Amino acid sequence: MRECISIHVGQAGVQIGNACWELYCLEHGIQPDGQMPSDDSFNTFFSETGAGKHVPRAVFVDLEPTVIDEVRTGTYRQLFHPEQLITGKEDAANNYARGHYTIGKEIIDLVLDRIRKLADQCTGLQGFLVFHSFGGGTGSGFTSLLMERLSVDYGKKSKLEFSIYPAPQVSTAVVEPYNSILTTHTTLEHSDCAFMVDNEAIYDICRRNLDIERPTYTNLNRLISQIVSSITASLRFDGALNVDLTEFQTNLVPYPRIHFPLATYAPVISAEKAYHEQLSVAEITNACFEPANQMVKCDPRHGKYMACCLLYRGDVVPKDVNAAIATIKTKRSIQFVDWCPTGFKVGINYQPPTVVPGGDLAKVQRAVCMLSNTTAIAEAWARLDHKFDLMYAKRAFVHWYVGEGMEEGEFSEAREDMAALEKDYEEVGV
């Protein structure tokens, strides 16, 4: 009951899932190899077999074998069902056309078959938790190809996404703008709420708060996993204000196309610093609204907040949430739109945050995860399309795309569509 299907695509998505299921196993007390020593709190994410084995409700897909070869050999080899770890033969090579039209074509029918088998075990399925990267070839093409089928086969079910988005200065590929610009049609038409995330923002956060000078990608994954765990905590546990996954979207999304909220978590803090301050509800609530703690490199002060969901977990009393939100409202720095006088959705859950034993993040009796639909993220797109415009003006790298079965006009039709999206976030800002 209240199940969720977690599909992981691309190297970024697969590694984020490797961190995320690691977090869940510690949360519900499941061993890494799938057994449970001694409630149905695990029923959302784990299906139970007669042998006492908890198999995750996950599907790992990548068109190259390397990362899923690692997960099939790592400590979590025994956790997953062997045939949901789906591998192709040819790497997508950072090309949307390959992932969508040519090489992702062959593997889609097996992926949807496994998704169907997972769905048939559900009694009360609720939605999808897709993890992918915008820049990646598989992380754009395969997610588009998969979502075009998912939106027609299971159309009513909500679809939640967790996306790593290209940064201002940090970049690991040259055609990231094209790949993202092509993923926009998926995220516009066949989505309901997608969470952007940026590597450089978490890098700066870890530099400033956690006091680590040079983190790896595992550190980023151990915060994105914390955020998604905070989202699903209301679904896996009891609480004062349990937030349903459709209630969640009904609060977050004002217009059919305006569904790209920011996400952030607090208190992001090291173990040494935590001993010298109190981390009251008011302090952590104020922490979420600083630009210092956003996970996308954009200033919230340059836009207007439209809708904020505060998911508190741990020893949080609703008195404190009320007093904190009033304090937030009296500030003239945090500006909301005129036509949403309500503003804040609040959920409170009684489960504290779990610390990964090898992790850096400290143990805290409270945590608050803040998700904000706001106009400032439009400036994050006004960046990236300007990166596209310089290249397509020269038809820079187009021959690789058109050579693999892609239509040329799809580029322009893509660039038009974001010009409509970036307009809308400004249009509602008046």
Binding site: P168, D299, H302
Partner: protein
Amino acid sequence: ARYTNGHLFTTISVSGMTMCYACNKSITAKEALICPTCNVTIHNRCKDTLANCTKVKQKQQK
């Protein structure tokens, strides 16, 4: 968003030997601003003292 003199300024992680584009002194902190069009870097304390974007970028093309 922000056009104090006429361009974007976004945070950048600064290292090694550097100089302000206006002070012509050295920046000590690990923070800095940067216009992707003008290709400059400043103290965070001289943002209003610069010229407009057009001036600086047409200057940069000598």
